[PDB]
Design a protein around this ligand. Structure first.
Ligand code: HEM
Length: 110
C-alpha cells in the first residue's frame, strides 16, 4: 500500500515550513517541526488526515463536511490552496498519486 502516513508527515513539514503560523491552530502549537512525530496531539491529527485521504480514495469522504469544519476554525480557500501545493510536493516525494482532485472537492465548498 502507498505509505500515506509518510506522505502526511512530509505534508505537514512542507506546510508549516511555508506557513509556520498555521501550526498555532493545532494542539501541537509551539512544537519544533523535527519533533512533531513524538508529539501526541500531532500523532492523532496526522492519523485523521491519513484517514481522510483513504476515505477520499475509497469514495466515502465528506468534502462538504470537512470544508465546514475548517471554516469553523477560520480556515479558508487561501489556506487550502497553499495546502494543495504542499500536498503535491509530499505526494511527489513518495511517488504517491497526487491528491489535487480531492482538495479541489474541498475547495468547491470554501
Ligand atoms: C490538504 C489539506 C487538508 C486536509 C486534507 C485536512 C484534513 C483535516 C482533517 C481530516 C481534520 C480532522 C477533522 C475532524 O476531526 O472531523 C482536520 C482538522 C483541522 N485542520 Fe485540517 N486539513 C487540511 C488543511 C488544513 C490547513 C491548511 C489548516 C490551517 C491551519 C488546517 C487546520 C485544521 C485545524 C485547526 C483542525 C482542527 C484540529 C484540532 O481539532 O485540534 N487544515 N483537517
Amino acid at each position: 500500500m502507498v505509505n500515506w502516513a509518510a506522505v502526511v508527515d512530509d505534508f505537514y513539514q512542507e506546510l508549516f515550513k511555508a506557513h509556520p503560523e498555521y501550526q498555532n491552530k493545532f494542539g501541537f502549537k509551539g512544537v519544533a517541526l523535527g519533533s512533531l512525530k513524538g508529539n501526541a496531539a500531532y500523532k492523532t491529527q496526522a492519523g485523521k488526515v491519513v484517514d481522510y485521504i483513504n476515505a477520499a480514495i475509497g469514495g466515502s469522504a465528506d468534502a462538504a463536511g470537512l470544508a465546514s469544519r475548517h471554516k469553523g476554525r477560520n480556515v479558508g480557500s487561501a489556506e487550502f490552496h497553499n495546502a494543495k501545493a504542499c500536498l503535491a510536493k509530499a505526494c511527489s516525494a513518495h511517488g504517491a498519486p497526487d491528491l489535487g482532485h480531492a482538495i479541489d472537492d474541498i475547495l468547491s465548498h470554501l
